């Protein structure tokens, strides 16, 4: 929508407003790069400022030494007209890693990606929770770990990790505050992969609360999370069964690109995400 607004209404207005008239032109990839790397806002005003900056650069380069006809600004020339890129887009991983899982977040400016990562080291049964986590999210981690302590035979977890293993859950980065209950499952996948030494597929984003007996409860803000998962190149989603009524708010081409799996139990998630053989030696 921002790319279409910048095509129709914003860029001809800024070009005519700056004095250029058809001696300069941008492409679409340049517009998407400017949006993704120079703009973090819900509205459209900062993008309007950036297109004004590009038109004023072009006017100065016209008044230094003129050219003939039209010059088409590509995506490589945007740092030559705007400077250092001041934001970094989210990248999806590709390899199954052991001890981590791919989660989805939600801001009032758009969803992001977040990565839960868990280390399991020999120790004496202590749980550390770092990364500026609120209280709801710590209690969600404790509920996930108690579910896993109750079901050690079902998943090949060690028989006594409650007093021989120290666990540590970290959510990068360490400076921004993070809160909420919508990542109950992500932590249950990461802790189970870290304890059973088998990798977790990073192709798949996931969300949903967890209860103490293993029910996946519905969550909020699904369209922003799914749009952010589609823009980062992830085509597989795990979602609660009670949120299938909210898939009708998505664009059609986004919904056709995503392979969505609907769950009720946590065991349906752990069967689907973990690779069936261990790769590392165990903890103790």
């Amino acid at each position: 929508e921002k790319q279409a607004i910048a095509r129709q209404y914003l860029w001809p207005k800024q070009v005519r407003e700056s004095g250029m008239e058809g001696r300069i032109e941008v492409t679409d990839a340049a517009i998407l790069r400017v949006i993704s790397e120079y703009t973090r806002e819900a509205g459209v005003r900062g993008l309007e400022r950036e297109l004004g900056k590009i038109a004023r650069k072009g006017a100065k380069f016209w008044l230094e030494g003129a050219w003939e006809g039209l010059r088409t600004i590509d995506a490589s020339d945007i740092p030559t007209y705007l400077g250092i890129p001041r934001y970094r887009p989210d990248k999806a991983e590709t390899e199954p890693q052991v001890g981590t899982a791919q989660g989805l977040a939600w801001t009032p400016v758009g969803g992001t990606l977040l990565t839960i990562e868990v280390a399991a080291v020999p120790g004496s049964g202590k749980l550390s929770l770092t990364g500026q986590l609120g209280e709801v999210m710590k209690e969600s981690a404790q509920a996930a770990l108690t579910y896993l302590r109750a079901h050690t035979q079902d998943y090949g977890l060690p028989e006594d990790f409650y007093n021989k293993v120290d666990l540590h859950v970290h959510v990068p980065d360490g400076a921004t505050p993070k809160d909420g209950p919508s990542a109950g499952i992500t932590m249950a996948t990461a802790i189970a992969s870290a304890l059973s030494r088998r990798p977790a597929r990073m192709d798949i984003a996931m969300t949903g609360e967890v209860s103490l007996r293993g029910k996946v409860m519905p969550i909020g803000g699904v369209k922003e999370k799914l749009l952010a998962a589609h823009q980062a190149g992830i085509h597989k989603i795990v979602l609660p069964k009670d949120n299938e009524a909210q898939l009708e708010e998505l664009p059609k081409e986004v919904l056709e690109g995503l392979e969505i799996k609907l769950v009720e139990d946590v065991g349906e998630v752990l069967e689907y995400l973990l690779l069936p053989e261990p790769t590392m030696p165990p903890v103790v």
Partner: protein, 248 residues
């Protein structure tokens, strides 16, 4: 004064206001509490400049040769000033009065802000004048006072125009962060009325009543921060950030 007033310049509504004091003859040689206000009024009326401008150079290569021998460093700030000046010279007629991305100089105290204003004003060969806006909190400090009062005084911009006789000088509105707003008064509405180049051509005062030539009167604003400028003023701006200096 009727020698002084029929000279070069003034428009014709100014002339209808100028024929006011022929029959305001005798109240100043004896009394009166409001007699010198009309004397001073037509002094102000013949004092402000009309139809006399300085022809301007807008060459950016002369602008680089002006700026570089007056300041050291600040090269990126120089370049954004050059971009603003290039788009100022390139647009004539339409989209020069619809959009003025008015310069805002933001930085800590101790960096060269006012010196850049004098160097810009000396680059276009025009006549600098600075108006500070430190403790300003009333609209009549920007506008005039009514001439029906005893103490009637026009605003600071009439002073800035009567200093230098160019139609279009360079005026630096220094420290607009410190415009204090409270109950019963803020001159930021008069700032938007005088600052946006689409209603300032119909500007007036409470002292004088005629329109003004505030069309190509070039404006520069300075600030120490952003978060205390009123939001209807934070749409007609274009910020340039001066960070602070290296040891060398």
């Amino acid at each position: 004064l009727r020698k002084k007033i029929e000279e070069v310049g003034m428009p014709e509504a100014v002339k209808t206001k100028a024929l006011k004091e022929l029959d305001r003859l005798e109240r100043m040689q004896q009394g009166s509490p409001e007699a010198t206000v009309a004397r001073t009024y037509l002094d102000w009326l013949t004092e402000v400049p009309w139809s006399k401008a300085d022809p301007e150079v807008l060459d950016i290569n002369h602008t680089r040769q002006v700026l570089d021998e007056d300041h050291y460093g600040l090269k990126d700030v120089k370049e954004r000033i050059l971009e603003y000046l290039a788009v100022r010279q390139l647009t004539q007629g339409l989209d020069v009065r619809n959009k003025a991305p008015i310069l805002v100089l933001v930085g800590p105290p101790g960096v060269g802000k006012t010196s850049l204003g004098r160097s810009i004003a000396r680059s276009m060969n025009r006549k600098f004048h600075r108006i500070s806006l430190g403790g300003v909190r009333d609209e009549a400090e920007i506008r005039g006072h009514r001439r029906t009062y005893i103490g009637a005084m026009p605003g600071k911009l009439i002073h800035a125009m009567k200093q230098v006789g160019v139609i279009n000088p360079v005026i630096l509105l220094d420290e607009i962060d410190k415009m204090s707003s409270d109950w019963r008064g803020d001159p930021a509405s008069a700032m938007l009325e005088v600052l946006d180049p689409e209603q300032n051509n119909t500007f007036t005062d409470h002292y004088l009543d005629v329109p003004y030539d505030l069309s190509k009167v070039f404006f520069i604003t300075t600030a120490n921060t952003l978060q205390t400028i009123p939001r209807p003023l934070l749409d007609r701006m274009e910020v340039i950030e001066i960070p602070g200096y290296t040891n060398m």
